[PDB]
Amino acid sequence: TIKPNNDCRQVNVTQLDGNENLIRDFLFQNFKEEGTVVVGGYYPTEVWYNCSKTLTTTAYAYFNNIHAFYFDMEAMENSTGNARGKPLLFHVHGEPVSVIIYISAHRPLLKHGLVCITKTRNVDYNSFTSSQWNSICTGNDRKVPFSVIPTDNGTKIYGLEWNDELVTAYISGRSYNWNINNNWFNNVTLMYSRSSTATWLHSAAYVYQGVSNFTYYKLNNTNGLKTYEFCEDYEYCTGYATNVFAPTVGGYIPDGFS
């Protein structure tokens, strides 16, 4: 899903600090009942990508042909009061509207996150993270500040999914929906490392993953205990075929369909 880069290495999301149940809480967000059920969707996997640079130069990463983008952070320093932030900036392209999400390190108190809805393709990644907080998403672009919860201590997975009619943002354990008709290009550009500035601090404490395939998870709720298991094949987990398929070149149903 990510272009081959030497900086970007893999990593086990569940093996990191404070990430024991990072995916379990996300999977059971909607299934609040008792029993086992097989769900499908653009769900994150266990192996994500960590990308860092020893130097203080500006680096970029590209995710292509993806449908959802998830990321997680580390525990904030002094989260109770003056929380210390770790900067990040990822841009989802589209026409005629594109969305830039930037978490910082004039600005309202504790509102580390900013969302910039812009209609201009020329986005300056070497100047957005170098100016003041009041001169970032100024002008005709729509600026929406938002406060990432520091008390969560990075134990909640953040995510963004989109389509041509609806955009869903998962923050903490809450999913928010926005209705907008926009032609998305299904690629995301992420700027993970740059020189330190007033708003940007040189660090690397972000994991991240892009999901493009239809992932299947079996969920079991036994006496209040919640367990999840990934399925590489729907038929193997359920004993029955699935209706999701990828049409071949020219728009032809594959011969293996049921």
Ligand SMILES: *[C@@H]1O[C@H](CO)[C@@H](O[C@@H]2O[C@H](CO)[C@@H](O)[C@H](O)[C@H]2NC(C)=O)[C@H](O)[C@H]1NC(C)=O
């Ligand atoms: C994201 O995908 C879109 C859609 O494919 C890309 O836009 C096209 O890019 C190609 C080159 O890859 C150009 O020849 C086309 O003219 C572009 N079309 C439009 C309508 O702009 C876009 O470049 C991709 N973005 C990134 C950052 O890779």
Ligand SMILES: *[C@@H]1O[C@H](CO)[C@@H](O)[C@H](O)[C@H]1NC(C)=O
């Ligand atoms: C994740 O842990 C497993 C063992 O549980 C190990 O084999 C694998 O290499 C780890 N993956 C990464 C990306 O470190």
Ligand SMILES: *[C@@H]1O[C@H](CO)[C@@H](O)[C@H](O)[C@H]1NC(C)=O
């Ligand atoms: C943490 O924040 C509190 C509340 O603002 C503050 O009193 C305290 O000094 C901070 N601790 C630090 C910066 O180590």
Ligand SMILES: *[C@@H]1O[C@H](CO)[C@@H](O)[C@H](O)[C@H]1NC(C)=O
């Ligand atoms: C986050 O960490 C702080 C400091 O250790 C702790 O007081 C707080 O309860 C934690 N929040 C959680 C675990 O939700």
Ligand SMILES: *[C@@H]1O[C@H](CO)[C@@H](O)[C@H](O)[C@H]1NC(C)=O
């Ligand atoms: C990513 O890797 C860097 C070294 O390249 C390391 O310092 C950093 O802690 C890693 N990030 C996470 C979230 O594990």
Ligand SMILES: *[C@@H]1O[C@H](CO)[C@@H](O)[C@H](O)[C@H]1NC(C)=O
């Ligand atoms: C997604 O599905 C395609 C089907 O061709 C497969 O080749 C690819 O490996 C899958 N990707 C992942 C991450 O499972």
Ligand SMILES: *[C@@H]1O[C@H](CO)[C@@H](O)[C@H](O)[C@H]1NC(C)=O
């Ligand atoms: C769910 O868990 C219970 C208790 O461990 C087990 O008996 C049952 O077989 C599980 N169901 C599925 C579908 O895996």
